[model samples]
Target chain A: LTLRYFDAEMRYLREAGKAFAQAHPDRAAMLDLDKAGTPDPCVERLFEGFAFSMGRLRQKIDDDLPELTESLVSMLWPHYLRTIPSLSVVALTPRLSVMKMAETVPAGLEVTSRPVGPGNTVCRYRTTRAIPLNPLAVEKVVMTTEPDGRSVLKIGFACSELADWSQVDLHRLSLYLAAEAPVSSTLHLMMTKRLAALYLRLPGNDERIRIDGWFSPGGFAEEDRLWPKGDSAFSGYQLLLEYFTFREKFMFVHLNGLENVSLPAGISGFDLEVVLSQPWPADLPVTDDALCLHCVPVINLFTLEADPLIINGLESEYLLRPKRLQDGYTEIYSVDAVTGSGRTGSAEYVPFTSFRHRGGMLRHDAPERYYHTRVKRGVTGMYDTWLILGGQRWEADRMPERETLSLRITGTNGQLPRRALQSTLLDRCEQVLQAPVSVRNLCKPTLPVYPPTEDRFHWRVMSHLGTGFLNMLSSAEVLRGTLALYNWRDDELNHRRLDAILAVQHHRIQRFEKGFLLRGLDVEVTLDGNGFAGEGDIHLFGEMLNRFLALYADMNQFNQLTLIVQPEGKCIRWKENHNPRLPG
Target chain B: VGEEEQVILSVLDNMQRILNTRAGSLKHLPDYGLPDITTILQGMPGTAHQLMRVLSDVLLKYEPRIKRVDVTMQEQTQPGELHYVIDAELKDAGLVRYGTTFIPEGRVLLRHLKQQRYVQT
Candidate 1:
């Protein structure tokens, strides 16, 4: 029923139909008997028509008759038919009195009975966990019973008005197709007998209930001369009554605790919970981050034989297929982290782009975080490069005792000067660290920061990777000269907003162990104003901005490197020329 | 030259036999009326686009009577897969709703009580 078995079952049913017609002629004709008949089978049929009808029922019993019968019933009758039909009504006191004979009400279990509208009886009960498990918990179910075996579906409710329940198979079949579940014989006999007893107690026997989905294909037809009704008071009323009475069996379901809610007790296998969230401005649009943090995806479970036509219909017709359905925002890729087998042979640097599901890339100066992984490398002499911000791709390999040297691009084919701008940056870095500096800034900045969108993710990625390293230099380097550089005016304005920047950085450090690295221009005027207001000369400002760019570019080159440093440092003097390179 | 003539005559004879066999098969097969109704009823407006083509060709070449066409449609009425509906509605809904409808419907056949079962209002 749950889309798990549709194809196989349907084809099986069609084949069964073909086989039924071929194997049993008389029984096939009896299936078409549409008009109502006496419960008594022909005393004559016992001797004459027995062989024919027996073959038909026998042939059908083996094939896909079970699911097919139920499916047919569901299609013929709408869901509403079962609920309001007059046949389901019953009398309370007598039904309970009769059902008690076959089984004892287990200890600690309680039952409360009430008369429903239009004279139907409703009984509610609860089973405590201490109750012993009954055979109902493990018994195999049968859809249709022969003279000896149990049928899968059974309808019983005690009522004096018994004619309506006469269409039990019709109604039962509908449930079978809908649920594709077998009904147990214990359930069948118990409910059927109980309905018969209560049927005698009801005040009126005249209410006629019209069931929309009574007969489904694999089971019955109108022209069949077969007598469906059994005589000798199998008590159709008693049958209908038992469905309202059964209990210990209800515990067989995979049910959860009911103490948390006030819904009726006997019901099983369903749960409901109400979640509350902090209230906010109703009119404002909820951003993606806000929703993700606060909202929950609600799910409710439903079982077979419940209202699906309406529910499934509602979801398919409404939420899932809504024209206003939220596909949410599009995202692009950014070079944030790299993952791979860090083996010496072909050290493959597999890139990860988190921005693909969210925004494309961080703008010139916005906060950002990179989720990254590291592989343990065994090669002893190979120097690892830490490309700093700025277009220049320099290296910070294992520093030699020496201070200044030339660095080359990984595979540049020897075009540009690998030794450009080496002295000034390296000297400032060592002076700031108060130790020999081995860091490099790789700048053949191949990654392009294009527009930030899902389709053009490459550009956004390039930009973020480029900017991330740059920010690390300017933000992390304790001194202006050694720091990465950015645009001059933006840096001045950003310094004025220093309080807000520190507040966020301190907050990230406290809560997430990581924080969004912002750009110089993007930093508020408060921070930038402080930079200019500090009384530094224009050359000093330009030099600081250049240093800032170098760090920013480094953040991009080595994806997902969480920038860490010693909290204590002071490196301002020892300017001019000092660069360092590592031996391969 | 003589062998070429013999082959040409043999080919004609074979073609005549094949055509005769086809004509015999056609006589035994049941005739269909859908083709005739296609013109008379003028149903399903989209079919009219191809009217000038197949219809004209057949009409010009054959002098045949259009008998009857039985249109059998294996119509799938329920939307989506039946099993999906069954599982979703029966298993999911019944469990969630937990109502009287959740009780099994086939209790009647299990017992010999066919029409003996009844409801009182």
Candidate 2:
């Protein structure tokens, strides 16, 4: 009896009739207002269709204004607004070799997916970095408790056959610790063995390859397990949190300087022992042979040159990349370069040259800029790179002859199905290197994902408007993620960027030994039971927040980060408005 | 022509409404109506038997006043339409018969018998 989208307008029309009845009783009487003030049967049906267009315009208008506001926010937060590629962990089972010959695969190597789905389309993934792929394997992995109230992790290495170990460059070798999740509680790290006295030279343990060491501004210490006064060394948890933010699924803990290990000719392999900085979580749920080695994280991303786009004036924009690879799942990592020729030779180009943001405040390009670049949704709904020659906002000063353009677009084939329910047909890959290794993933590659857009970006700029500066906004995004509207193939993937961001934040680390020692924020994090699972543990939740904040929070203006997990999730942070964990 | 006859008349009204309604037309009570078999009636005769069974089932299913419902066929010798006897048992009283005509060009029409039949008709 009522139109759904048009009911509000219809209701308004009835109200108008009610008013009209009073405004002119004589005229209303001829109109024959029934008990319901019903209109003519033909009249109601006539506008019912017309009503839809009116309602559609209202919805369509809602989209336009927000999209326009976003246009402004995107320009301001240019660096933070990039389409961040997804990260995943890839593991290769090196082929057996009787001779100790070194085998390696360099980074940026492309390994494609086998055909999958009804369309039988394939996805592409590339190695995140170089790894020496040899017959290296982790063995006899076990986690157990020592009687004196401490825990220990026992991991050993052995080769299948005796090969000259010297052929392997021990100095170039790296020892990595892999876990099911992307966390390492190493700020207060402990291994029972001494460098010189222990095998593999815990004796030579002088080699420190702290993973987060490379990327922090400065480090402070509040007693990393009572080692009073250090950055005596820098805090490990904060650095690792940023690392987790970047690496995500492809996270690993690097234990370098294996060069210090005095390789013995007789031994096929050696073992190492690590003391627990804390007690076993839920009493060693770590099963026998749980640890694996020689794993490197893989991203569901690679770079490819898009087909050339010609600026035939009639066409406004062009689809920079081809859709042949899972048509709609294009990631568009970055428009690395736009070199075009118009009888003027190929050269570097910038979008909106007036803003000129390739570097600093000063403008350096010739005013005769070939094209003003822009990204907009194409006819196929993928982000089409527009060769902005003409638009109302600005016009291209120099128009080249029916100009043709070429560029390299870095995108991701990350839309491959997630979850282990399917056989790893895609995981069974073809290597560009053709290294004799069977490929598998310790954790699956990320879905094609990008930076957050819409009100999500709006709220960050709004939240950080006064209290924090540009760094705060970037911190918010890094702590969160560069999430796209998922305007491409899968919108569901966009919705789950929060999941990848939160999974690393899941492990509640309560110990300051495992958290960052920063200027205190009166942040109180409480974890609630939110899943299908029956319950939640209080200790586990507090532990989650302590770690979550250190990973997702800012150095200053604490409430912004503190309030993040609170509003969403069934979590609520309780506080007495004072810092209890301050360095008293 | 007493109150008992009035009960039978009320039951007839309900049966008319039920048989005339198209299936699934009612949102709240989707099962209340009979299926529209207008085309089936026009096409063939097996449909005549199916309609009788459906009519009997619809009356008994929707009308609690009647304990038993049965539709027995009779011939319209002049030939195109069919006449059927609407036989039912009222829970408070005796078995009754109401006459009905099934018109091929039009639809089912339920009417009264010229003389009431409380016994075998």
Candidate 3:
């Protein structure tokens, strides 16, 4: 064999055998070492096994590099690679015919789309927000301006029994509004007009109530933090003040209109409205959920449980896929335990690093068993999972299969799950209450973009090394260094966002805020070609840039960094259409 | 004799132990001696060349006294045996050379090489 390709150990063995036959033909003939150096087939097979195993291991290090670097890149968090979880606001109906008490639909409820093929898999969604089940539906939403004096945003509610909400328990009713303050800055509160007045009208009683209050996260009774804590549901005053003073999401308001007034005779339904001193602001959203009810925003993640497998060393890997879920991506979030065939308690497993890495880890844990996960990213952009069992050194190969392995995994569709129709939603409840209930999807789903891919990322890191990141230079190099961390050219979703971080054009740096005192570097941000989604996006990108640079910048060198974003060459439009804060 | 000269003699003693002992003899420190030439290295071609490299690598890696070492197989080396000369730079000593012969296929429990006893070059 050529010196370049041969293993020194193999060469040494054969060469020693050659010399053996040369010295003593009589002894060498006994083992057939003299005849043209022909070793027995079985003996050769033994040597070959060890040889290729070493070679394969040598190649495995190369094979393991992509995921290894990804694990190492865990320091920065895989924000660029992972898809931003889309929140779909969904609604569930209560079977009110057999209703007794107020039933609470807890958060993280799983709902699946009808299966597509082989009747095996569906896109699953778990509720991100929880709601109480009551017989109330949002029937009327109207926005009007009375002679331009003030703009009115009204939300009306009605019930099924007693012709309307006439006999309904208004005292027990509370409106959960997914609302938030946009900005509380001096400029926004002064010039940008928000809610100036709040009112509730019970037309049948010819009475109007000034509802100047709402409930929020702060007004909780116990530390366990369940809302409306045991029928202690009451509203707080000074909503106008909190609107100007704070920024949050989703306020809770109980109907405090009839608290002091007598029962309004034959009251069918009630109306609630807020008047703004001016028309809607440009920053507000225009989504269809402007006046929606019984809806809760959901995420595309579902926790999966797989039946435990009897781990014999013969099988080192186990595939875990739920029949009712689109087995697009699975993650070994936790390999909870492994137990013996006997009735003994299960043992714990530490998340194991590679053998090369284990050596560098100073403190040895010395676990009885060890397991590690490998996330195999598919061509279709799903990260399918495989669990590796390591006892001494990934011991599934060394030990026999008597133990059982339990896996705790999470499954998610990288893209948005299938949409749910009116009948497809429950796909539950009802028997518990029995009004013949149902659920429906609101707002056709936002088509999700694929997670970003990092191809040639190993080489992408190589350029940063060559740039001498430690001996850092101009702001140009800083931007270039940040861009090198991302392979944005391939993934268009984050590509457009990261382009704002650095560009060769008028990407100037204003090194003078508190000039002479050496303050922050103010960036002249050039807005991208296509328009960003909203002003909300612009504010978020600015904060991300400030923080992104804060990670690299020495605070002693600069105390602050402002990413001043002012669009150019387009967006000559203003006074845009906003459907107001009708309620998302 | 002075202790420095005694130390020089001990180098030869260490060389003898290391040359005769097979690999994997030490408890914790494996690669303490030469390869198991009797079995794995037996009946192989270029046995002398492999021995020359093994002699050089062992001294360079594990012998703290040797800063640089070389093993050159002498001309007319006999079959089934290695005749080599070591050119080494030793601590507290100038460049020195020693010659020896080794038979790899000797009995397992017995020493395979000889004449590595003297101290001086």
Candidate 4:
């Protein structure tokens, strides 16, 4: 198979070899060399030079360069791999740790600060790898202050194994930060760049055959700043081809967590093919033709329910006005009772007024300000000097908007396909803006099976307050129902015989109403051939159905266990004592 | 030399090289061989069509022996397997071997032995 990644040097050698082989057709298999058992010295020499030249370039990249943006990292990673075939491993570490290590200067390094052009302070230094073998290299670092006067340190690194401090020094650095700083910072390492090549095989034919130029994370086109080079709109077939060709453009990354949907078992990869229902519509919005991308397994986050006060650590005060009772009956009255000075047993003994009034006597007026102040000081006597200082008012300088410290690009669409097989858990959910609108844009290997109809079935039943059929069928459990054939006229309620004790598996449709119970099984069954079964009995209906459904409030737990009904000879009785409780 | 003989040798050599080589390892000669032989191995009419297009393009471009190439599978091939037949005509030689080729099994040695046994009897 073609080397997945090809560098300019390798391409040149390959072109020369092809021309040489064709010219000397007799020894073509030996790449135009003499038919000796060993490769010709000249051919060997050419390849050696190729390898050596590649090493110099890569060494230059690893030694002299400062830090790289994520986009730049992705671009250079493939180029480096293509040039130096021997150097297959590439690790991308965030620039923070490098900055931290620079703070605590290591051996053989000179750190000098200088003012640079733009609003920048440059730190110029030469560093050698920990091992003594490699030569020293120089880099200039810059810390730029934004318009807001917030500064961010831009650090660089020698992006190679020789410069990797992760094995030992990083661990010690991590511990130091954890102990010394209130909150510790983090660095991201991208090791997948080397393994990003696509591997495809056709079984029983060429199981190891590889396709060339299909997919590469290291590959880039002309413009690299924005995602998905070209117009966002793409035809379904065109998008499929893009997915096969530029798979990396579709992956999503988060600053805080790693999130990806797992593919089904035994499937490693997928091919893109499409069947258009009709001719492409000229009048349709160009976006309709464009592929909407979505990264699966991202929580749709429909509704976040929480006690906001508790979670946010906030407290609240509530003003509760007390009620008053008039005579024997209780009434809500804010009127305060005031007593007025009057002769004993006088009719106007009380006056209704606001709370400012004391019991029946008019309030005394304040004393003259100077006299009152002196009197208060005398009464309070000489007090101890307990100085009360106001709390410190702390303010922080504007922090530069978090400069995309780590960035990942992914498609965000949650609309499930019209096909039931392509349904997803978030199909009914609102589209996550960052996710793509179509399944074709998903980065996962195998597509997610539509949320089984049963989940929808459960959602439909529960959302409607369990007013659906399954609730009626399952109500037999709540009614304490047992399958039974009873006499048409049995006022005594003792004339029925136990049929089979009933148990309904709503998802499986594997019912357990086995016995000599009735004339028919009145279940309305809808089987979509996708492991979904919704059951409801046509015979059972009434006002009590809703009440019975409320009895099983936790549909999440109710779905797991088999609903068991004990035979009671006449009618099934719900096992109140055996109510299914959520398991810990 | 007979024109048909030259055509046969050229066709044999081209097929031999394609079967022996893998596709992507070398950059300059990336498309020099049938890289997706395995893809066509587990076959359908559609797969055969795709393979035929590539094969025809490669042969017509590189082989001096043939002016035209048509590679197609037999209709009655077994299930789960496919057999392809390549049909071509010489450029200037004209109407070279039109169908498949095979060596007669043990023609010289077996006849000689039979004749000696007859003579001995």
Candidate 1 residue-wise lDDT, A205-307, digit = tens: 1133222243221111110001111111122222211232222121111111113323343432112221112121123221111000000011111111111
Off by over 4 Å in 1: A1-543, A546-584, B1-39, B42-53, B56-121
Model 1 DockQ class: incorrect
Question: TM-score (chain B) for model 3?
Answer: 0.50
lDDT of 4 by residue, A223-267 (tens): 111122122223322332223232333322121211221334343
Categorize the docking of model 2.
incorrect
* Model 4 Cα lDDT, one tens digit per residue, B10-89: 45555555545555644545665654544344433565456556655655444432423345533223533333322322
TM-score of 3: 0.45
Cα lDDT tens digits, model 2, A44-120, are 33254456547656755775777656665545534334444444455566544522453554544545454454444
A91: Cα error in model 4, Å: 46
For candidate 3, write residues A1-584 as lDDT tens digits. 22322454445456555764566677665655443322211134335445654654565567677657755465232223333343444566654444444345453345646553334344445543434445434433444435433433333333333222323333344434332224222112222333423443433322222231322111101111111111111233222112211222322212132222233445532333444465444444433233334544444545666566556643555544444344444232334334433223245454543233343544465434456544554524455444544545433444355444555655445433365332263455344433444566543443343434456564456444544663234445544444432332233443444445342222222244344333334343344444442343433432232333233334233322334345542321111111122211
DockQ of each: 0.01, 0.01, 0.01, 0.01
Query: Best to worst by lDDT, what's the order?
Result: 2, 3, 4, 1
Kindly report the docking quality category of candidate 4: incorrect
Specify the poorest-scoring 10-residue window by lDDT in model 3 chain A: A216-225
Docking class of 3: incorrect
lDDT of 3 by residue, B1-121 (tens): 2433443455556656676666687542356676634432334355557666776676555543332234554323223344222232222221122211111111111112223211111
